Amino acid sequence: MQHITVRLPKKARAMIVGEITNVFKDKYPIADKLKVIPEYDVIEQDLCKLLSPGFPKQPLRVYKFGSRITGIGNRSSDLDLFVDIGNTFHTFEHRASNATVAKLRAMRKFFCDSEDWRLINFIEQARVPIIKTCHLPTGIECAICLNSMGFCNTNLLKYIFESQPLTQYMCIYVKNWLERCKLTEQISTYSITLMVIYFLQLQALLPPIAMLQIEDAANQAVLVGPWVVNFAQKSFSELGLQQLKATVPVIKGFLRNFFAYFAKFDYEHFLVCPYIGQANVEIAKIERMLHARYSAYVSDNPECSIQLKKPMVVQDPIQLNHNVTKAVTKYGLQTFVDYCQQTAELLEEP
Ligand SMILES: O=c1ccn([C@@H]2O[C@H](COP(=O)(O)OP(=O)(O)OP(=O)(O)O)[C@@H](O)[C@H]2O)c(=O)[nH]1
Ligand SMILES: O=c1ccn([C@@H]2O[C@H](COP(=O)(O)OP(=O)(O)OP(=O)(O)O)[C@@H](O)[C@H]2O)c(=O)[nH]1
Ligand SMILES: [Mg+2]
């Protein structure tokens, strides 16, 4: 019923009204530690040893990505892995090719037969097909794919989080909030990460991604199909952006404003747009504001444009044809908005 507000789940309410310190006391130091632990080298080595024989004359490289690597993971987080077999890094696949699916199918048997791996699930129908498998010596669940784009946006998030740590604290908070609100079926960890990034861009605390991707005599694009996946690694001092120390008061204030902002955002006409990094980016206008490679890509592939006829539009800042919240329904959006409203209220000072 659209005339009634969806009540914030008690599990979320107890954590919000509870101290924000308890939300980080343990979570931030764990997340920081998990950016680099020796277990990941063991996983990398075991994965290469396992898979090389199946692809004998081909280069093979493992790329770690996802929340562990960016610094918002916890001990139960998966480890996301991109296996590059035969220099596919720079090849864009909107949906996986038959050749990609064949390689993933071949990889399945290796994990099945190995004593060191428990095959959990082989997901073939997804946008990004993945093999979910537990590395038994470490106990870490690995999510293995053949698509480089997540690794690319992981390196962007890592730069953002390291340059402006407030961002990372906020993402740890909002990730946990999403879980306690039971919103993860429609809004992913990565979606809410992009929302935090966009919010802070509007506070002049983060640069637009477009500004990091100027193509001139000094800087050339790394391309994955039509997408520019590199970025200038400028100091924030050179960018002219201040770098805050995240304290509990500071985080609490930015979080209240975050939820207040997305509580009142006009999802019918505007999109969350970390590429442009400015306020009030119109759904009606975004496609004309993108780089010429986008226009050329869609002109040749009109079925592959960003999906804008959706309740909630959050555009990936690198894979510009991807609305990462395209699965949010009308009622799921109302639920999100209602939860944001109630959360910002509980974060007010007296
Ligand atoms: O490289 C990736 C990409 C995505 N994912 C994660 O896989 C999960 C499922 O991905 P989606 O949320 O996109 O839903 P889906 O499987 O039905 O595929 P589409 O609707 O987009 O067509 C999501 O939680 C995503 O974050 C990865 O783990 N690795
Ligand atoms: O829509 C999507 C979803 C996911 N991804 C890419 O897949 C990465 C892994 O997608 P995950 O679903 O594993 O999320 P996450 O690792 O960021 O956080 P967890 O819930 O696992 O702790 C994401 O961090 C992103 O790089 C996309 O590129 N697009
Ligand atoms: Mg992950």
Author numbering: 201 to 550
Sentences from the paper on this structure:
Terminal uridylyl transferase (TUTase) is one type of enzyme that modifies RNA molecules by facilitating the post-transcriptional addition of uridyl ribonucleotides to their 3′ ends. Recent researches have reported that Drosophila TUTase, Tailor, exhibits an intrinsic preference for RNA substrates ending in 3′G, distinguishing it from any other known TUTases. Through this unique feature, Tailor plays a crucial role as the repressor in the biogenesis pathway of splicing-derived mirtron pre-miRNAs. The structure of Tailor contains two canonical globular domains separated by a large catalytic groove, which serves to accommodate the 3′ ends of the target RNAs for the post-transcriptional addition of uridyl ribonucleotides.
